[PDB]
C-alpha cells in the first residue's frame, strides 16, 4: 500500500514521496475548504442537531452540479453566498487564478473523469 489488479496519459510520479508529506503546511493548504466545511458541519451536528449538516451538505450537492463543463472556467457565482465566503477575499483567488491555467487537459478526458466513469 495498490497493485495493477496507459502510462503516457498519467506518468512520471514515483510512489516514494506521496506517502511522505512536504513542508508541514501541505495538508493544511491542499485540503482547506474541505477541512473548514467538515469542522463547521461537526460543530453544527454537535450543538444544533443532525438536520443541519445533512441539509446544508445536500444543498451543496444540489447547487454543485449546474456549473459549466470541467474543461472551462467556472464562475461559481452561486454556492458562495451560501458557503459564507461572499466577501472573504484571501490567498485563494489572487494567487494562481484558475482562469489563467498554465496547463490544460483534453475536453473529453476531463469530462469523463469528472463523471467518474474512468
Amino acid at each position: 500500500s495498490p497493485v495493477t489488479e496507459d502510462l503516457l496519459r498519467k506518468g512520471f510520479s514515483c510512489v516514494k514521496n506521496e506517502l511522505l508529506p512536504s513542508h508541514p503546511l501541505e495538508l493544511s493548504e491542499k485540503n482547506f475548504q474541505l477541512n473548514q466545511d467538515k469542522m463547521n458541519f461537526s460543530t453544527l451536528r454537535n450543538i444544533q442537531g443532525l438536520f443541519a449538516p445533512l441539509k446544508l451538505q445536500m444543498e451543496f450537492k444540489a447547487v454543485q452540479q449546474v456549473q459549466r463543463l470541467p474543461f472551462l472556467s467556472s464562475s461559481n457565482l452561486s454556492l458562495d453566498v451560501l458557503r459564507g465566503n461572499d466577501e472573504t477575499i484571501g490567498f485563494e483567488d489572487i494567487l494562481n487564478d484558475p482562469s489563467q491555467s498554465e496547463v490544460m487537459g483534453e475536453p473529453h478526458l476531463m469530462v469523463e473523469y469528472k463523471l467518474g466513469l474512468l
Binding site: 459549466r68 457565482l77 477575499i89 489572487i94
Partner: protein, 229 residues
C-alpha cells in the same frame, strides 16, 4: 409550444424563448435614464416606495463600486444584490494584483461573462435584471448597459426600463454633446417627467453623478434644489 418551457432547446426558427421572456420581464420594470456628457455622467431613477411607511435610508438602489463605478438596476429587486456583491469582489480581486484601479471595460466584460454563465447551462433560470454602469477613466467618461443574456454596448443616452421606447424617442432629439452636468441633470429630470404617473417629489429621485472626483451621490436636499430649479 413544446419547444418553449426549457432554455436549453432552440425553437425551429432560431431563438431562445426564455431569454426573450426575461428581456420582456426586465422591460416591465422601473424606468431609468442615463446621460453621458463631455464632463461627466448622470444616472437617474425612481423607486416604488411611494408610501410614507417606507424609509429613505436602509434599502437603496444606486450602490457605488470602489470609487469610479456606479450602477443602477431596472429589473427584479432581490435579484441583483448578489450580482453587485460579485462585481465588488471582482473589482477588489483586480485591485490586489495590478496595483491600480479597475478600468471600466474589464469589469463590464467580467460581469457580462458571469451573468451569461447562467444561460448556456441547463436547469437554472437566467437573471432577470439589466443594469447600466458608469465609469471615469483616463480623463474620459464611460457608459455601458448590460442585457440578461449579456452583450455590452457603448450607449450614450439610453432610457431603458418601463416605457423605454418613448424615452428613446424623446432623447433622440435633445442630446447634442458638448454639455456640462448642469444641463444633463435637467434633461434627465425631463425624461423622467415625460413618463412618471404623477409629479416628482423630494423623495422620488436618486440621481448620482460620476464627475472627476469619484461617485458622489446627490443628497436629498441637493436633489430638492435641482428639482425646484
Amino acid at each position: 409550444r413544446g419547444y418553449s418551457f426549457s432554455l436549453t432547446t432552440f425553437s425551429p426558427s432560431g431563438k431562445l424563448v426564455q431569454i426573450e421572456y426575461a428581456l420582456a420581464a426586465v422591460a416591465g420594470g422601473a424606468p431609468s435614464v442615463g446621460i453621458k456628457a463631455a464632463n461627466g455622467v448622470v444616472l437617474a431613477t425612481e423607486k416604488k416606495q411611494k408610501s410614507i411607511l417606507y424609509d429613505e435610508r436602509s434599502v437603496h438602489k444606486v450602490e457605488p463600486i470602489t470609487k469610479h463605478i456606479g450602477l443602477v438596476y431596472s429589473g427584479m429587486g432581490p435579484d441583483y444584490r448578489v450580482l453587485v456583491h460579485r462585481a465588488r469582489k471582482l473589482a477588489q480581486q483586480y485591485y490586489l494584483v495590478y496595483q491600480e484601479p479597475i478600468p471600466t471595460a474589464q469589469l463590464v466584460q467580467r460581469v457580462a461573462s458571469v451573468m451569461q454563465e447562467y444561460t448556456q447551462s441547463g436547469g437554472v433560470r437566467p437573471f432577470g435584471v439589466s443594469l447600466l454602469i458608469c465609469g471615469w477613466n483616463e480623463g474620459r467618461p464611460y457608459l455601458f448597459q448590460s442585457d440578461p443574456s449579456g452583450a455590452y454596448f457603448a450607449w450614450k443616452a439610453t432610457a431603458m426600463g418601463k416605457n423605454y421606447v418613448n424615452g428613446k424617442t424623446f432623447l433622440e432629439k435633445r442630446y447634442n454633446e458638448d454639455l456640462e452636468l448642469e444641463d444633463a441633470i435637467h434633461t434627465a429630470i425631463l425624461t423622467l417627467k415625460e413618463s412618471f404617473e404623477g409629479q416628482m417629489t423630494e423623495d422620488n429621485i436618486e440621481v448620482g453623478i460620476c464627475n472627476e472626483a469619484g461617485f458622489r451621490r446627490l443628497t436629498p436636499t441637493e436633489v430638492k434644489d435641482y428639482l425646484a430649479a
